[PDB]
């Protein structure tokens, strides 16, 4: 199966690459990823920029090489064996008509099915940058795949050296529902189950936490009593401080 682990180097390369090649809005940057993917856990362990150009006449007419792919994987192999190519890279502008159409060409020199990592590697979006997709036709049919990170023991320690709640999640929740409604209205208009049906009745009854509140309450007294002992304890420590001050004053008066 699938369960995808993604190098922080992948995200950071894609970022740096887009500015450094002077790639604007209304030009794509396309790439390759390789690692190990013949396993239940797809390991993305490296990646590389691919030469990509798109024409004035129609911008779903485009050029990707395959020779930069022929001999570059056989330089990937030579530092770390097991870092052949299984798929591909995108920075956006996202979800175009010919963003389907790199799939049939990338099927020519992959060993399973092109894995499509679109990533918002300008880091401009809000939330996830990773718009991961298994590249399946049928058109831009595009089942998404959830999973970023897992990296090496050395890299994570290095990461931390570089860098050195309920509401935020609720606001996200509100925005999805609000978006979902807007879509449903649009969808009726254009046209002229179960997941939505569990997302209404189930939550109707902090909402869920209500039913639970009965059980919570009993333990809730107990954990409250525990905080009260701690308050007494702070008072006890306090009394010593008052004495310390009291002593000093007393010595100053003798003297």
């Amino acid at each position: 199966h699938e369960k995808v682990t993604i190098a922080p180097l992948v995200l950071l390369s894609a970022l740096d690459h887009y500015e450094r090649t002077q790639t604007k809005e209304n030009k794509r940057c396309v790439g390759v990823i390789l690692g190990d993917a013949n396993s239940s856990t797809i390991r993305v362990t490296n990646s590389f920029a691919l030469p990509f150009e798109e024409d004035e006449k129609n911008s779903d007419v485009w050029f990707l090489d395959h020779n930069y792919i022929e001999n570059m994987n056989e330089m990937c192999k030579k530092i770390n064996a097991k870092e052949k190519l299984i798929g591909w890279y995108h920075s956006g502008p996202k979800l175009r008509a010919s963003d389907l159409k790199i799939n049939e060409l990338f099927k020519k020199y992959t060993q399973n099915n092109p894995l499509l990592l679109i990533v918002d590697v300008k880091q401009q979006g809000v939330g996830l940058p990773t718009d991961a997709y298994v590249a399946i036709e049928q058109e831009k049919t595009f089942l998404h795949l959830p999973c970023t990170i897992e990296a090496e023991e050395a890299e994570e320690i290095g990461v931390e050296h570089l860098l050195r709640i309920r509401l935020t999640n609720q606001l996200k929740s509100l925005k999805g529902l609000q978006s979902k409604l807007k879509d449903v209205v649009e969808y009726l208009d254009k046209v002229i189950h179960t997941i939505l049906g569990k997302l209404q009745d189930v939550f109707n009854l902090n909402n869920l936490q209500k039913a639970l509140t009965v059980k919570t309450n009993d333990e809730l007294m107990v954990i409250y009593i525990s905080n009260l002992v701690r308050s007494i304890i702070a008072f006890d420590d306090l009394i010593e401080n008052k004495i310390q001050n009291k002593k000093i004053q007393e010595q100053r008066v003798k003297d």
Partner: peptide
């Protein structure tokens, strides 16, 4: 639609 307005 009815369910959406309510969940939201």
């Amino acid at each position: 639609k009815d369910r959406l307005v309510e969940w939201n």
